[PDB]
Short mmCIF file of C-alpha atoms and ligand atoms in Angstrom, two decimals:
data_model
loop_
_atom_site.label_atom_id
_atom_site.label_comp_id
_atom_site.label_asym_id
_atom_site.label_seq_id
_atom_site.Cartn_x
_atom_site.Cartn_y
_atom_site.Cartn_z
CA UNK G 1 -19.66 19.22 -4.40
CA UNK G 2 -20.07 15.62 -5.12
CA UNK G 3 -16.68 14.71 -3.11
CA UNK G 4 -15.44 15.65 0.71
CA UNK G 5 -11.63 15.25 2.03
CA UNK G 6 -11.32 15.54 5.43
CA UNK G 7 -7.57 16.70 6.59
CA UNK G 8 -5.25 18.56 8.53
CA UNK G 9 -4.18 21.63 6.89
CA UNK G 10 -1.03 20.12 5.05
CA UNK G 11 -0.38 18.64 1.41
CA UNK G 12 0.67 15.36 3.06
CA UNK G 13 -1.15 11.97 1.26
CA UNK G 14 -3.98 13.84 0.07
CA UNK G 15 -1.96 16.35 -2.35
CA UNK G 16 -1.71 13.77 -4.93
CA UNK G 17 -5.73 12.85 -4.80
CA UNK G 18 -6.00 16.29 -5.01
CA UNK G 19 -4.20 17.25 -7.98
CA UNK G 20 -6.52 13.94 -9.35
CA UNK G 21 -9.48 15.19 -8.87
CA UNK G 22 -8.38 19.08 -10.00
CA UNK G 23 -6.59 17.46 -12.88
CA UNK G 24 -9.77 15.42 -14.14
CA UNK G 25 -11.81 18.88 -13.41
CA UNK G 26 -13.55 17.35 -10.71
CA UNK G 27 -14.79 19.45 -7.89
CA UNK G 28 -14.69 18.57 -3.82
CA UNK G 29 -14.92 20.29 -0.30
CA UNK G 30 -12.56 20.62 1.98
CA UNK G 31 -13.34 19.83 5.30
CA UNK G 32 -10.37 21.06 7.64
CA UNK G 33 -9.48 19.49 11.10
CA UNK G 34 -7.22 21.58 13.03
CA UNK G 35 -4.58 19.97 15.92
CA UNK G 36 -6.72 21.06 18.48
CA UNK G 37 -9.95 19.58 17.15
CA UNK G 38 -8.10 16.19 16.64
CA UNK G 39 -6.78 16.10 20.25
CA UNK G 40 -10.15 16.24 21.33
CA UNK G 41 -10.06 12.93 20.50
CA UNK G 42 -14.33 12.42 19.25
CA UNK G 43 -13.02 12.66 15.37
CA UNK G 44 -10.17 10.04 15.72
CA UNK G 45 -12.50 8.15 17.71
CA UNK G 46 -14.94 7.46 14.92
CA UNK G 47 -12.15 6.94 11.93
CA UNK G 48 -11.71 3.52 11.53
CA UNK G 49 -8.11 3.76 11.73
CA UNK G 50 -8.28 6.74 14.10
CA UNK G 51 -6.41 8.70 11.39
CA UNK G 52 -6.83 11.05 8.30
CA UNK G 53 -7.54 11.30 5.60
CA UNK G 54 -11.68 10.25 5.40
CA UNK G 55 -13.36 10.76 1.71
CA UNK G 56 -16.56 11.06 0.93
CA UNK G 57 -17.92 10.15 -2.14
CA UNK G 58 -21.41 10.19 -1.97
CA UNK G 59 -22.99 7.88 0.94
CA UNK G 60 -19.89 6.05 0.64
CA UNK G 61 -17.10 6.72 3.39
CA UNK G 62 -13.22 5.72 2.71
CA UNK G 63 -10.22 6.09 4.95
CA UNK G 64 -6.51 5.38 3.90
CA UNK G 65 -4.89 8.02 1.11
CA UNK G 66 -4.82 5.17 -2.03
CA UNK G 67 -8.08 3.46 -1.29
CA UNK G 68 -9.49 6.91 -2.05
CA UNK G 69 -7.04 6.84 -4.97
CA UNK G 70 -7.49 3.33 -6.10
CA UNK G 71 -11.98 4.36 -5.93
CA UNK G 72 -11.21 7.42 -8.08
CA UNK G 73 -8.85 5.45 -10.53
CA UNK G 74 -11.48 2.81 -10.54
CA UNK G 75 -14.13 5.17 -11.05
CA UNK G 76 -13.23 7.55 -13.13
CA UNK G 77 -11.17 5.46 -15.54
CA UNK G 78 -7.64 6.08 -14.68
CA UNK G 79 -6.01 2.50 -14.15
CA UNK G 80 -5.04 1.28 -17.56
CA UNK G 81 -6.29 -0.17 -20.38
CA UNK G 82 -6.62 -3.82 -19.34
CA UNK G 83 -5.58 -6.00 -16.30
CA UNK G 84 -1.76 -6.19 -17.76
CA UNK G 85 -1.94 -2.46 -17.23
CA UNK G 86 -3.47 -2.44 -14.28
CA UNK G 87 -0.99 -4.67 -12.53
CA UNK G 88 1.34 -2.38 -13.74
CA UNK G 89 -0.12 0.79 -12.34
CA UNK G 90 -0.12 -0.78 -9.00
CA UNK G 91 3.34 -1.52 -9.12
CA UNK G 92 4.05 1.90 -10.04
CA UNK G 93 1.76 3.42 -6.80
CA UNK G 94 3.25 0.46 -4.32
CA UNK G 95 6.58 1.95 -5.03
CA UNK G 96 5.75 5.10 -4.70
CA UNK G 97 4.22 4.25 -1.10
CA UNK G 98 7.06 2.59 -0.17
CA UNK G 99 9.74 6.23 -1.28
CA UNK G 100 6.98 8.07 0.45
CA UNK G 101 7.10 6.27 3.90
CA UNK G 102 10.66 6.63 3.80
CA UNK G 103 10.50 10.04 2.82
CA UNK G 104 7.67 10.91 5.96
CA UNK G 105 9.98 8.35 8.62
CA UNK G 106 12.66 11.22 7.74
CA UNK G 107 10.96 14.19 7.45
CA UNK G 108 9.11 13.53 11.21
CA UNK G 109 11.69 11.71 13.02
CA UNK G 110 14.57 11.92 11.71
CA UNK G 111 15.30 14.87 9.77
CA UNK G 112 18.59 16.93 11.12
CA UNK G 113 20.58 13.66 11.62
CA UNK G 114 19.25 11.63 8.44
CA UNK G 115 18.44 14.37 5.69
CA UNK G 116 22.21 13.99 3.75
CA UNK G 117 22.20 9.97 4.03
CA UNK G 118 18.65 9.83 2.81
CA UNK G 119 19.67 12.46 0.13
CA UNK G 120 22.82 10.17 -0.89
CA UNK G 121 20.57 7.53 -1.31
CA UNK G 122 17.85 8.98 -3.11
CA UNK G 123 19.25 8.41 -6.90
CA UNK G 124 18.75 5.00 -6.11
CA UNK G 125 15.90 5.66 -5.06
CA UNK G 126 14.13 7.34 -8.13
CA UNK G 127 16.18 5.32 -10.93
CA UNK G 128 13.04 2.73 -10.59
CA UNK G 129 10.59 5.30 -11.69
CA UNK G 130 13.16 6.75 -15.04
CA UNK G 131 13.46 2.68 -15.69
CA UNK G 132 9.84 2.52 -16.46
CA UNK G 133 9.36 5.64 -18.21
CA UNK G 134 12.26 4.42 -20.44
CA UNK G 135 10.11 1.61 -21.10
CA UNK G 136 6.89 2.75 -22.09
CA UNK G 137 7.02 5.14 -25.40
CA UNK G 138 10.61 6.74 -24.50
CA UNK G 139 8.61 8.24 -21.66
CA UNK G 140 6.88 10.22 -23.51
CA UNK G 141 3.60 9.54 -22.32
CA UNK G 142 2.35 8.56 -18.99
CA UNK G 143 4.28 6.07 -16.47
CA UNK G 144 2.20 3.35 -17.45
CA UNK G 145 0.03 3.21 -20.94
CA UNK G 146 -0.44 5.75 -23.10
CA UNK G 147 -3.61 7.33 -20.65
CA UNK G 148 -2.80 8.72 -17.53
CA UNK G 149 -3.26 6.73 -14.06
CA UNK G 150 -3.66 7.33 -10.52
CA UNK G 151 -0.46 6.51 -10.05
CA UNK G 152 1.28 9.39 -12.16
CA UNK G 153 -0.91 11.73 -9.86
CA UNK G 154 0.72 10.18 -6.70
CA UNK G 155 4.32 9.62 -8.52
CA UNK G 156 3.90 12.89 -9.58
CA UNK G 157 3.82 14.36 -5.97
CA UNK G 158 6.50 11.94 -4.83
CA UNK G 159 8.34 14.00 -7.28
CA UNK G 160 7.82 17.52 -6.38
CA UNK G 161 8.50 16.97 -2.68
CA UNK G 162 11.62 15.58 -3.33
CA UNK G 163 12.75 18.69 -5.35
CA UNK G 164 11.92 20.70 -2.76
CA UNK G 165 13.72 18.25 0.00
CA UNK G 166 16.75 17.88 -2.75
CA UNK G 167 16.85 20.67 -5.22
CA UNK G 168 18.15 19.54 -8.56
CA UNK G 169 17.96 15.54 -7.50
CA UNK G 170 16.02 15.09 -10.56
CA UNK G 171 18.63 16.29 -12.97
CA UNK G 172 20.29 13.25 -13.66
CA UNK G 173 16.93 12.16 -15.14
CA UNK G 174 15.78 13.60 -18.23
CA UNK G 175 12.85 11.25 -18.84
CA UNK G 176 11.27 12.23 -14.85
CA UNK G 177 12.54 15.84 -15.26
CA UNK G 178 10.18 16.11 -18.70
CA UNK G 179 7.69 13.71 -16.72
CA UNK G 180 7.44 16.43 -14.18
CA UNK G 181 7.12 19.30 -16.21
CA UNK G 182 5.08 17.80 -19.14
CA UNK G 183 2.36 16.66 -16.60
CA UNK G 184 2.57 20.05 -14.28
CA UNK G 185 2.03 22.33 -17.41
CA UNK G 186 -1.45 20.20 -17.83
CA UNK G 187 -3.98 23.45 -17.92
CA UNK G 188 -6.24 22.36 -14.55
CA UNK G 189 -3.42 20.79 -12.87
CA UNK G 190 -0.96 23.98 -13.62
CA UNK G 191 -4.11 26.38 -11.95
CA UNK G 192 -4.68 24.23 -8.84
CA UNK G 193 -1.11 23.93 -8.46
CA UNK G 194 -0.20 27.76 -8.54
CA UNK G 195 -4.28 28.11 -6.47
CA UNK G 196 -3.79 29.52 -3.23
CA UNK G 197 -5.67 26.26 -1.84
CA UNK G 198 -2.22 24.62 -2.68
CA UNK G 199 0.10 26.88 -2.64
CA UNK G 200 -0.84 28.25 0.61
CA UNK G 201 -0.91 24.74 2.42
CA UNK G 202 2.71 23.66 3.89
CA UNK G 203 3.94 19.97 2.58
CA UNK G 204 4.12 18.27 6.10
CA UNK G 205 2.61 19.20 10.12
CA UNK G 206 5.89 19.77 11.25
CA UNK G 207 7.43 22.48 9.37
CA UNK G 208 9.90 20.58 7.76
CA UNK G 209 10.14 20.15 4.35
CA UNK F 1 3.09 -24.37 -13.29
CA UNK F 2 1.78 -20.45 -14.65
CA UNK F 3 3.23 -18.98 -11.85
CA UNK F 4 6.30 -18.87 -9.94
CA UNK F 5 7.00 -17.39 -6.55
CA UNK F 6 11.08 -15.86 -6.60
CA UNK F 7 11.93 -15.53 -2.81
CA UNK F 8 13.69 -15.97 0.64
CA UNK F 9 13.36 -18.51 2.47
CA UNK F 10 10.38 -17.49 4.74
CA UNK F 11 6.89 -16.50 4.93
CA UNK F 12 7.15 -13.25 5.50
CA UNK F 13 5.33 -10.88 2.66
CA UNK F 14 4.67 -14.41 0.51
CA UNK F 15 2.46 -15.78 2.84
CA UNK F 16 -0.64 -14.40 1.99
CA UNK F 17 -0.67 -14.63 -1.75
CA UNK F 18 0.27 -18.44 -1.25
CA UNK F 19 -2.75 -19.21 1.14
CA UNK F 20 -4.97 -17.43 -2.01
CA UNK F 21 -3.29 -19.43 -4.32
CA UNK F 22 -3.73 -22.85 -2.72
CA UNK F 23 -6.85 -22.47 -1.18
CA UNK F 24 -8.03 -20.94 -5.05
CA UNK F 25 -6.49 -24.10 -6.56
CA UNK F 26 -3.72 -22.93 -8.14
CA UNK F 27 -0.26 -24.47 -9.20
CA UNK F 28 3.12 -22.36 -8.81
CA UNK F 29 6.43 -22.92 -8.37
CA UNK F 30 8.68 -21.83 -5.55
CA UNK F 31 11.89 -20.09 -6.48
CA UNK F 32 14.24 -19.49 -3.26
CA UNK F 33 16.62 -16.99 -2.97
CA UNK F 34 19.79 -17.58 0.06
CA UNK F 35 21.07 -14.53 1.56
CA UNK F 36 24.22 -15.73 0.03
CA UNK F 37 22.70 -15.64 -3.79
CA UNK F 38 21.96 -12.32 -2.66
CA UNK F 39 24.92 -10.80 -1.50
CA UNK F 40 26.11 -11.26 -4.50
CA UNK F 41 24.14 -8.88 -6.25
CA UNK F 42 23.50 -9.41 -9.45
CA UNK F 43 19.79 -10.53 -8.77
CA UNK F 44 19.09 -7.73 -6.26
CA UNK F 45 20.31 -4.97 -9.10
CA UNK F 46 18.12 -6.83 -11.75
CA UNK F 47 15.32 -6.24 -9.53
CA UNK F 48 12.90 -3.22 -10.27
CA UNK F 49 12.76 -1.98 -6.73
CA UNK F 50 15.80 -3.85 -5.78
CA UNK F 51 13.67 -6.38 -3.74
CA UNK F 52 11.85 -9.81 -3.05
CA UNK F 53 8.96 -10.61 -3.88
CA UNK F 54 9.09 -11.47 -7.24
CA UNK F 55 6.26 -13.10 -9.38
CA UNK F 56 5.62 -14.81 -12.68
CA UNK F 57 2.35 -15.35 -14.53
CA UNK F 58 3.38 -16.08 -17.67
CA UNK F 59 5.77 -13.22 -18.80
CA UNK F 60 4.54 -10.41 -16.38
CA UNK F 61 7.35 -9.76 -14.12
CA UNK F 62 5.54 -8.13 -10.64
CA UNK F 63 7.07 -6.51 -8.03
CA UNK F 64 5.74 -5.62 -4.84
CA UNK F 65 3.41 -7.96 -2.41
CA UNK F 66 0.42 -6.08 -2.65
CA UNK F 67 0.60 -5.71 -6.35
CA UNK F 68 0.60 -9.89 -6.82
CA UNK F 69 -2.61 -10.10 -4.14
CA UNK F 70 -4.62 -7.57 -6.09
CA UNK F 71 -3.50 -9.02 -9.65
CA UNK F 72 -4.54 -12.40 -8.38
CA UNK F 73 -7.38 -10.95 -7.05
CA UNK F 74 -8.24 -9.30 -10.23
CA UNK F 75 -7.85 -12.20 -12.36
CA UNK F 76 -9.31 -14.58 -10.12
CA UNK F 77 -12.37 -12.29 -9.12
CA UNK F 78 -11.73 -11.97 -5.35
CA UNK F 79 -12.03 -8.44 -5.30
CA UNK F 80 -16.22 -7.65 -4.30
CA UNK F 81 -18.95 -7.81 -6.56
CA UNK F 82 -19.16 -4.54 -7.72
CA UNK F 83 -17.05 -1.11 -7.20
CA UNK F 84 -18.16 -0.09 -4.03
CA UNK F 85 -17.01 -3.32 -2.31
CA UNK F 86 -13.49 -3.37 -4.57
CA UNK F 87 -13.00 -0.11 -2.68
CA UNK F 88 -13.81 -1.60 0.64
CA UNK F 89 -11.53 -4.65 0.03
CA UNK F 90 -8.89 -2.04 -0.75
CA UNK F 91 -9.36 -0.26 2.39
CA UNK F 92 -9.27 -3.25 4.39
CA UNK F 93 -5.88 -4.55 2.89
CA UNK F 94 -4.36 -0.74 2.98
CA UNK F 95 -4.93 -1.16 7.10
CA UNK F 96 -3.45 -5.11 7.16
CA UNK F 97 -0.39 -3.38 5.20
CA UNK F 98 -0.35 -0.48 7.70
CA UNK F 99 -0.31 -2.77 10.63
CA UNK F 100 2.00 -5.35 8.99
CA UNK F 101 4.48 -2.49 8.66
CA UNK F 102 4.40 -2.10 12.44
CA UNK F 103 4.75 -5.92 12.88
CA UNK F 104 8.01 -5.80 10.61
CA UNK F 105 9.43 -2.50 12.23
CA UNK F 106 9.43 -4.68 15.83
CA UNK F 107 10.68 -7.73 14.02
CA UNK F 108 13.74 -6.44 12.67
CA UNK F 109 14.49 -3.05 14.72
CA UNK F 110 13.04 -3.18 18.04
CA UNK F 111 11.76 -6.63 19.20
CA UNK F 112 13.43 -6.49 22.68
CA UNK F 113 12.76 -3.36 24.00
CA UNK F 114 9.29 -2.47 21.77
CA UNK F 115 7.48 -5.75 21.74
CA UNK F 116 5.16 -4.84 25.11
CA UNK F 117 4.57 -1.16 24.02
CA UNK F 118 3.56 -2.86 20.63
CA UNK F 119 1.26 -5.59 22.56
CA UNK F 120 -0.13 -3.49 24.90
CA UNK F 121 -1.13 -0.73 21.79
CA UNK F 122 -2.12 -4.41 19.61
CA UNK F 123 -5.74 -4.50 20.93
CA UNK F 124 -6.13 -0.98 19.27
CA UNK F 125 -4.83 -1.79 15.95
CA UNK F 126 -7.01 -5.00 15.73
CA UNK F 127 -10.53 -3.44 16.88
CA UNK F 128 -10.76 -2.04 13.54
CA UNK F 129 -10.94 -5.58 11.95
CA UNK F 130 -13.80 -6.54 14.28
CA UNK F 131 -15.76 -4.15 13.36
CA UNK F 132 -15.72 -4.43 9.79
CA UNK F 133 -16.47 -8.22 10.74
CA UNK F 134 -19.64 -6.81 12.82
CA UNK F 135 -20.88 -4.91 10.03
CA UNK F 136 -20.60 -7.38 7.35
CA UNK F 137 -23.36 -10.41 8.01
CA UNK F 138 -22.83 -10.68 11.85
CA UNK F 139 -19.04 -11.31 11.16
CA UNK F 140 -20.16 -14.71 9.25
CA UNK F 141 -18.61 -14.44 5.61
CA UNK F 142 -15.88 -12.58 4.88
CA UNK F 143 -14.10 -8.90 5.75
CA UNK F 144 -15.82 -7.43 2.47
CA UNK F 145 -19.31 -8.78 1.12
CA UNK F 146 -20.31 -12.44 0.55
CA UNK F 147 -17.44 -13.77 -1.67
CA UNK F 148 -14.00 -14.21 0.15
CA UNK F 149 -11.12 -11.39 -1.50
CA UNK F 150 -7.55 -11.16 -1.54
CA UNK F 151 -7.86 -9.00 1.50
CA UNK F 152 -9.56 -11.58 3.73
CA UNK F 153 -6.14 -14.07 2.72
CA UNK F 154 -3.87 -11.03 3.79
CA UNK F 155 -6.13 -10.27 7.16
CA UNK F 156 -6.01 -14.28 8.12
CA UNK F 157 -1.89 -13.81 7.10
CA UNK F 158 -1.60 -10.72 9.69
CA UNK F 159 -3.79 -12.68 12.48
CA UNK F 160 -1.96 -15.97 12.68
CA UNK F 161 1.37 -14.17 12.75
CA UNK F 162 0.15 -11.94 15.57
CA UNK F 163 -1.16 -14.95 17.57
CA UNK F 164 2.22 -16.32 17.49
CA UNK F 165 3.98 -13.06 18.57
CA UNK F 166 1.56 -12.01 21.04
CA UNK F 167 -0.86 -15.80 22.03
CA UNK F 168 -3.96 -14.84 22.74
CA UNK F 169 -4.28 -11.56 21.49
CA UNK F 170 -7.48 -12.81 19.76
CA UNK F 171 -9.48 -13.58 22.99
CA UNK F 172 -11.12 -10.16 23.26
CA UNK F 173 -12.24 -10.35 19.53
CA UNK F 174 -15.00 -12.76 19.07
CA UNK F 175 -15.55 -12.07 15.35
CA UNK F 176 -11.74 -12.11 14.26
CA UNK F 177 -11.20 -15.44 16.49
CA UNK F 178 -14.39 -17.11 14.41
CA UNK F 179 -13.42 -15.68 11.24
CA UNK F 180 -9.48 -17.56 12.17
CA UNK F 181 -10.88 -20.57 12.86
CA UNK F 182 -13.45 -20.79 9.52
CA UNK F 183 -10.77 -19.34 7.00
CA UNK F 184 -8.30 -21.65 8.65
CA UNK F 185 -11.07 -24.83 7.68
CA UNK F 186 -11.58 -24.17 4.57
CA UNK F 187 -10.39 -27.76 2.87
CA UNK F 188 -7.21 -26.65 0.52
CA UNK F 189 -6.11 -23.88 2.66
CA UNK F 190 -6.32 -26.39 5.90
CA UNK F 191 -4.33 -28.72 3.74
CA UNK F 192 -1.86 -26.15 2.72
CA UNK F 193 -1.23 -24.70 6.24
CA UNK F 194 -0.47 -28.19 6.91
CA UNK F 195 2.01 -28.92 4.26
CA UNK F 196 6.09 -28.81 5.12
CA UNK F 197 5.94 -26.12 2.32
CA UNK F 198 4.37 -23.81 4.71
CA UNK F 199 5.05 -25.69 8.28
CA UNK F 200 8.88 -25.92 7.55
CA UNK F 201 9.84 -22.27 7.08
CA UNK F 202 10.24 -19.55 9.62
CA UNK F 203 7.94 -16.78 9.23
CA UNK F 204 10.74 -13.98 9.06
CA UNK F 205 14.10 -13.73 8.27
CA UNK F 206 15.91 -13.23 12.12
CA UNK F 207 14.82 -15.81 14.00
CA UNK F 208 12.12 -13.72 15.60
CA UNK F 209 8.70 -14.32 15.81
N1 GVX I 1 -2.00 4.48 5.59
C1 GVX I 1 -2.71 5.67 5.91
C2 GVX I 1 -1.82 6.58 6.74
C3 GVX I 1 -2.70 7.69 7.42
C4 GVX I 1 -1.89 8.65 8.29
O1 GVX I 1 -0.68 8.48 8.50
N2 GVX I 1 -2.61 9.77 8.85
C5 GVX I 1 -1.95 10.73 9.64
C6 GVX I 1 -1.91 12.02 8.86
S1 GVX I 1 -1.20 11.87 7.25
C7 GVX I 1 0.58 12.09 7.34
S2 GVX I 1 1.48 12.31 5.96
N3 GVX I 1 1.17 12.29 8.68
C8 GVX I 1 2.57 12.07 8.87
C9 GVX I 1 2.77 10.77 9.61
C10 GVX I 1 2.21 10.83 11.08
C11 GVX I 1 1.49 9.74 11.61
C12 GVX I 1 1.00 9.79 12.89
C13 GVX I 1 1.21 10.90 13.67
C14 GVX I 1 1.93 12.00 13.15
C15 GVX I 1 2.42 11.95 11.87
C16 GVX I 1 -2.79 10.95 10.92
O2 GVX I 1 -3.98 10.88 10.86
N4 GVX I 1 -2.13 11.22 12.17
C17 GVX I 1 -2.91 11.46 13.36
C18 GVX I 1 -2.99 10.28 14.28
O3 GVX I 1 -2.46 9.15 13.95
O4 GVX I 1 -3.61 10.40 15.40
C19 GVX I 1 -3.09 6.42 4.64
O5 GVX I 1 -2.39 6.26 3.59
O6 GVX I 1 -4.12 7.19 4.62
N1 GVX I 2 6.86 -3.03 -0.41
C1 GVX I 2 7.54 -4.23 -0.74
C2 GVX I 2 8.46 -4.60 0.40
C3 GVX I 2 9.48 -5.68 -0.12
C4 GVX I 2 10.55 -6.03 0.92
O1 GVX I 2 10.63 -5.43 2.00
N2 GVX I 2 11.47 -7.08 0.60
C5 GVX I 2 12.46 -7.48 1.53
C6 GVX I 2 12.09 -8.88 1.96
S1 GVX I 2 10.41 -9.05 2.53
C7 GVX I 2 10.35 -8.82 4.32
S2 GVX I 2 8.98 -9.16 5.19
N3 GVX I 2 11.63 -8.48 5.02
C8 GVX I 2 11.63 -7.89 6.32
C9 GVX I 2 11.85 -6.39 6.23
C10 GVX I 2 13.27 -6.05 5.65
C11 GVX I 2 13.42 -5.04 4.67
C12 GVX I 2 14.66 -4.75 4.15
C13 GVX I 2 15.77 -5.45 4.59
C14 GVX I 2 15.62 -6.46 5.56
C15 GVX I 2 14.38 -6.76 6.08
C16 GVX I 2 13.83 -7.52 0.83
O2 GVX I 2 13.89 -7.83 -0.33
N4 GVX I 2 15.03 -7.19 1.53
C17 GVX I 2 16.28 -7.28 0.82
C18 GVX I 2 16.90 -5.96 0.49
O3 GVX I 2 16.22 -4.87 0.63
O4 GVX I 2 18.12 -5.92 0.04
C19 GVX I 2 6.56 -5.39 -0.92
O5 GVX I 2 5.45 -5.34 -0.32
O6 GVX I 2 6.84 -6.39 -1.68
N1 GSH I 3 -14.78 -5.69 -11.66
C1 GSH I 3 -14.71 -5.98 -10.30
C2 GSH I 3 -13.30 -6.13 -9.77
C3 GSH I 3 -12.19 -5.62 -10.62
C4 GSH I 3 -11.43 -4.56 -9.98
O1 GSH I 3 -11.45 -4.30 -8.81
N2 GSH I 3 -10.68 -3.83 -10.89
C5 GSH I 3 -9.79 -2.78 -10.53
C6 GSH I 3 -8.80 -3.28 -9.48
S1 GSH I 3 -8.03 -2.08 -8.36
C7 GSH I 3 -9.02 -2.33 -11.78
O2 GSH I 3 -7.84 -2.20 -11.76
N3 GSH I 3 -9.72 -2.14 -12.93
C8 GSH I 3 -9.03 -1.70 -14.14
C9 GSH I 3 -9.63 -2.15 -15.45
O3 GSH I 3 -10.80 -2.54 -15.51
O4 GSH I 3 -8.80 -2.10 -16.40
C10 GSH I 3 -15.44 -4.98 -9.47
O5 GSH I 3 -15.96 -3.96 -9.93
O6 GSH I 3 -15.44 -5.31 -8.28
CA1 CA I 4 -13.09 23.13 -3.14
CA1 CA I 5 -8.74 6.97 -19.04
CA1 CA I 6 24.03 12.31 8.67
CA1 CA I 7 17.87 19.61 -15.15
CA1 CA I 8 4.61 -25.74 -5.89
CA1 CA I 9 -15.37 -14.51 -6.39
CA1 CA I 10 9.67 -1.61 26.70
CA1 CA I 11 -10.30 -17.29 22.89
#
C-alpha cells in the first residue's frame, strides 16, 4: 500500500484520516504499536514529537494527526475550490481541534467528575458547526463548498464520538443530524465504518468512551 | 488598511500573525476588545466560536489563530515551494500550537505550582525545533526550506515568549538561539518588535508571564 499509519490500537486522531483515505478508496497499512512496545521507549525516541500518530506517504514521513490530514487534503484535492474556501475549511478543522481537545482533556482526566458539565455544555458547543451548514446550500452539501473537505472527515468523527459520549445530543440539529447520516451512508465510508478494522478498535486507550 | 485585527488587549495568539504581517509589509488595523466590552456579550455571541481572534481581509470574517497564519501564508506565499514542504511547514506549526497550548495551560491554570515541572520538561519540548533547524541548511534559513513561512513567525512567537518565562532556556540550543537572533534582525520585523504597538502590551491576559 502506498500509505502507512502508525498507532496504538484505538480510533483516537487517526479515525477521521482513516475514514479519508477509505472514503476516497484509498488503500494503507496499519502498523500497530502496542503499550508495551511504546514503553520501551526506542519508538517515542525517534518521533519527533515522541508521540503518535507517524504517516508515511511514500519517502515522506509526517507526525501530528492534521498535518497528515492537511497532506492528504492537499494532495488529493479535498480543501476547496479556491483560497476563500480554503480559509474556510481550516476554520472548520481548527474548531473541530479545539471540541476535540476538550473532548480528550475529559475523557482521560476528567471523566466521572466532568462528563454531565461537559455534556451541559456541549449544545454550545456544536451550534458552530449547524451555523455553517445553515450557511452553505441549507446544508445540504458538504460543511464547506459544494465538494467534500478534510475537514468534514474530521468534523465528521467529532460527531460520532459525541453521540456515543451523549446519545441523542445531536437532535436538536437537523442540518448535523442529516450531515451525519448523509455522509455515513457514502458506499466506502458506510463499509469501512461497519469493517471489523473499525468496528473492532475502541474510541480512546482508556476504556472510556 | 485591508485588514483588521479584532482583539484583547495583549499579544497572546495575535502575536505571530502581526510579526508576518509587518515584517511582510503589510498595513492593518488594530481593533481592541476590553474585558468590559466583553462581558457584555453581545460581541462574544456574534462570534463563530464565541472567541478572539477575529480577522478582516476584505469581507472574509476568520476565526481561529491558526486559520489567519495559514490564509496569510497562502496568499502571501509563505507556505514552501512545493507540497512536500507545505506539509512540513504544517507539521512544524501543529507542534508550536501543541506546545503553545502547554504554555497557556501554565499561564492561566497552574503558573505557581506547575511552572518548574513545565521548565524542567521545556528542554524536551524544544529539542524538536533544533533539529528540524539541523536538518534544514545547517540551521541557516528558515524551519522549512529556503523561503521564510508562516510557521517560522509562529516558532520565533513561541521562543521569545518562552525566554521571558523561563531566561535562558535557549542556551542549550545553538540553532534555535541563531535562528532568534536572525529572525529578530530582519529590518521591519526589528522595527516592529520595537514599536509601542508591540512593546506596550502584556503578552497575556493575567499579569503572568
Ligand atoms: N497534536 C498531536 C497530538 C498527538 C498525541 O496526543 N499522541 C498521543 C496519542 S493520540 C491520543 S487521542 N491520546 C490521548 C491523549 C494522550 C496524550 C498523552 C498521553 C496519553 C494520552 C501519544 O502519542 N501519547 C503517547 C505519549 O505522549 O508518550 C496530533 O494531533 O497528532
Ligand atoms: N483556538 C482558538 C483559541 C482562541 C482563544 O482561546 N481565545 C481566547 C483569547 S486568546 C488567549 S491566548 N487566551 C488565553 C487562554 C484563555 C481561554 C479562554 C478563556 C480565558 C483565557 C478568548 O477569546 N477567551 C474569551 C472567552 O472564551 O470568552 C484560536 O487559536 O484562535
Ligand atoms: N501552492 C503552494 C502553497 C499553497 C498551499 O499550501 N495550499 C494549501 C494550504 S493548506 C491549500 O489549501 N490549497 C488549496 C487550493 O489550492 O485551493 C505549495 O504547494 O506549497
Ligand atoms: Ca489496510
Ligand atoms: Ca475535490
Ligand atoms: Ca459534575
Ligand atoms: Ca433526531
Ligand atoms: Ca496599524
Ligand atoms: Ca515566499
Ligand atoms: Ca511544583
Ligand atoms: Ca546563550
Amino acid at each position: 500500500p502506498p500509505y502507512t499509519v502508525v498507532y496504538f490500537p484505538v480510533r483516537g486522531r487517526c479515525a477521521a484520516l482513516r475514514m479519508l483515505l477509505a472514503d476516497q478508496g484509498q488503500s494503507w497499512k496499519e502498523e500497530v504499536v502496542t503499550v508495551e512496545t511504546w514503553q520501551e521507549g526506542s519508538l517515542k525516541a525517534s518521533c519527533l514529537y515522541g508521540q503518535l500518530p507517524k504517516f508515511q506517504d511514500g519517502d515522506l514521513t509526517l507526525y501530528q494527526s492534521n498535518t497528515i490530514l492537511r497532506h492528504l487534503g492537499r494532495t488529493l484535492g479535498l480543501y476547496g475550490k479556491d483560497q476563500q474556501e480554503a480559509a474556510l475549511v481550516d476554520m472548520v478543522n481548527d474548531g473541530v481541534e479545539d471540541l476535540r481537545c476538550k473532548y480528550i482533556s475529559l475523557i482521560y482526566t476528567n471523566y466521572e467528575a466532568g462528563k454531565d458539565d461537559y455534556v451541559k455544555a456541549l449544545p454550545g458547543q456544536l451550534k458552530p458547526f449547524e451555523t455553517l451548514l445553515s450557511q452553505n446550500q441549507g446544508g445540504k452539501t458538504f460543511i464547506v463548498g459544494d465538494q467534500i473537505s478534510f475537514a468534514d472527515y474530521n468534523l465528521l468523527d467529532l460527531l460520532l464520538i459525541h453521540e456515543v459520549l451523549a446519545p441523542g445530543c445531536l437532535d436538536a440539529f437537523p442540518l448535523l443530524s442529516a450531515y451525519v447520516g448523509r455522509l455515513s451512508a457514502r458506499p466506502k465510508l458506510k463499509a469501512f465504518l461497519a469493517s471489523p478494522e473499525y468496528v473492532n478498535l475502541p474510541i480512546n486507550g482508556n476504556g472510556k468512551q
